[PDB]
């Protein structure tokens, strides 16, 4: 019954066993369920893309020599990638903790689905990093509208840009920290003046949706119509695998949780996607 101290032999082992002992799961932090999915087989995808065009070409007469116009393209190849993680656990720790087994698998799985999206869409181009979308997409800037203005104000301003493309928007794809502050509407009242004034948060502004993702860069917001603009090809779907029978378990009893996917990303028309960077 009664303990007298913070010290216990009882601590080391399970004193009760339940499938719930606490846990978390997020649906909104992944850009991959948001977009449409289709399978593909092949080690890579080949696209042809349009190069820079200055644009303009005015009409000229029929007693003056006809005007012309041209398009330029560069061809591109996208190789496949593998995203994977392993997490290493001691069986004793695992068995006694109980929900720890489930939690570690769901987290490593979530972490792989975030890391695939993160590389393909954003990151920078380095010797171990890709960046497809971010490179291709056309410029747009909040700064023209005003340089230093509220988080709310940016999200409202941003909606308008999409119209230009002939999307007439769909939804805005924002970073999780940013989305939290915009919704909060901080400006040093922290009252709503760019979001509906009777709410302390909103899930439609301008009558358009907000998607909040943690696979996107910090102080970056992207308007686009995710379903037409990109598509997710799957060579292999995400799956956890578990192996207790490899070199390190043999040497000392150990359990491995395996989590992996093999991915590729398709760009159907990525010069409709606009990237804007937050100032405030």
């Amino acid at each position: 019954m009664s303990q007298l101290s913070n010290q216990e032999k009882e601590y080391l082992i399970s004193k009760a066993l339940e499938t719930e002992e606490g846990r978390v799961a997020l649906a909104q932090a992944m850009a991959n369920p948001i977009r449409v999915s289709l399978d593909y087989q092949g080690v890579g995808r080949k696209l042809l893309v349009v190069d820079p065009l200055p644009q303009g070409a005015l009409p000229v007469y029929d007693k003056d020599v006809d005007a012309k116009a041209f398009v330029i393209s560069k061809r591109g190849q996208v190789p496949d990638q593998v995203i994977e993680g392993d997490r290493i656990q001691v069986p004793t720790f695992e068995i006694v903790s109980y929900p720890q087994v489930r939690f570690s698998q769901v987290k490593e799985r979530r972490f792989n689905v975030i890391d695939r999206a993160q590389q393909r869409a954003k990151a920078d181009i380095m010797a171990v990093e890709d960046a497809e979308i971010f490179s291709l997409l056309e410029g747009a800037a909040t700064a023209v509208n005003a340089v230093t203005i509220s988080s709310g104000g940016l999200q409202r301003a941003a909606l308008t840009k999409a119209f230009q493309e002939v999307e007439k928007h769909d939804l805005v794809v924002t970073k999780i920290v940013m989305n939290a502050s915009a919704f909060a509407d901080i400006r040093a009242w922290g009252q709503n003046e760019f979001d509906p004034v009777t709410q302390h948060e909103v899930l439609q502004t301008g009558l358009f949706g907000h998607i909040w993702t943690a696979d996107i860069l910090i102080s970056k917001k992207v308007p686009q119509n995710t379903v037409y603009v990109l598509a997710d090809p799957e060579f292999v779907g995400v799956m956890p695998i578990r192996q207790d029978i490899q070199v390190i378990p043999a040497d000392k009893p150990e359990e491995l949780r395996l989590g992996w996917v093999i991915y590729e990303e398709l760009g159907l028309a990525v010069v409709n996607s606009l990237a804007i960077a937050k100032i405030s």
């Binding site: 042809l48 893309v49 349009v50 190069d51 820079p52 065009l53 200055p54 041209f70 330029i72 393209s73 560069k74 061809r75 591109g76 190849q77 920078d124 181009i125 380095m126 010797a127 960046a131 971010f134 490179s135 291709l136 997409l137 056309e138 410029g139 010069v271 990237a275």
Partner: protein, 150 residues
């Protein structure tokens, strides 16, 4: 330079096009270099680079030679001044770039000579060293990449 990352793995890591300062003879009419697609928003090495010869696009853009095979055009009178930095994927000027040379060093890969075709990918490659030929003075044979003089 970068035939040492090259040999059929071209367009990975930093590559310049220059090992020595370009010859005389300015080109008139300024224009931009970009190797991107509707803007260069590429930052950092690897990915598409602007190494290789060039082609004029709308005569307002120059970019890397990424045309189709057959009716290929050999040597050209300049290569773009290097803006290769880690704030870029190869050469791509965010000002207007003005070029020069009598022709200079370029990079060739493949089992050809100094002259290939284009498969719409940066630089030239292709086989047949007897249906192709050196550019510049003296015979040079290709075995792992070399800097060929126009």
């Amino acid at each position: 330079p970068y035939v040492r990352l090259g040999y059929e793995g071209i367009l990975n890591g930093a590559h310049d096009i220059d090992v020595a300062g370009l010859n005389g003879v300015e080109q008139l009419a300024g224009k931009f270099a970009t190797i991107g697609a509707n803007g260069v928003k590429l930052a950092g090495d690897n990915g598409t680079n602007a190494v290789g010869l060039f082609r004029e696009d709308l005569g307002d853009m120059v970019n890397a030679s990424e045309k189709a095979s057959f009716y290929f055009r050999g040597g050209e009178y300049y290569v773009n001044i290097s803006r290769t930095s880690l704030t870029a994927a190869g050469i791509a000027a965010g000002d207007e770039i003005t070029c020069d040379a009598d022709g200079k060093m370029i990079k060739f890969t493949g089992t050809g000579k100094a002259l290939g075709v284009v498969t719409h990918v940066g630089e030239y490659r292709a086989g047949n060293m007897y249906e192709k030929a050196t550019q510049g003075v003296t015979d040079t044979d290709t075995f792992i990449g070399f800097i060929m003089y126009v």
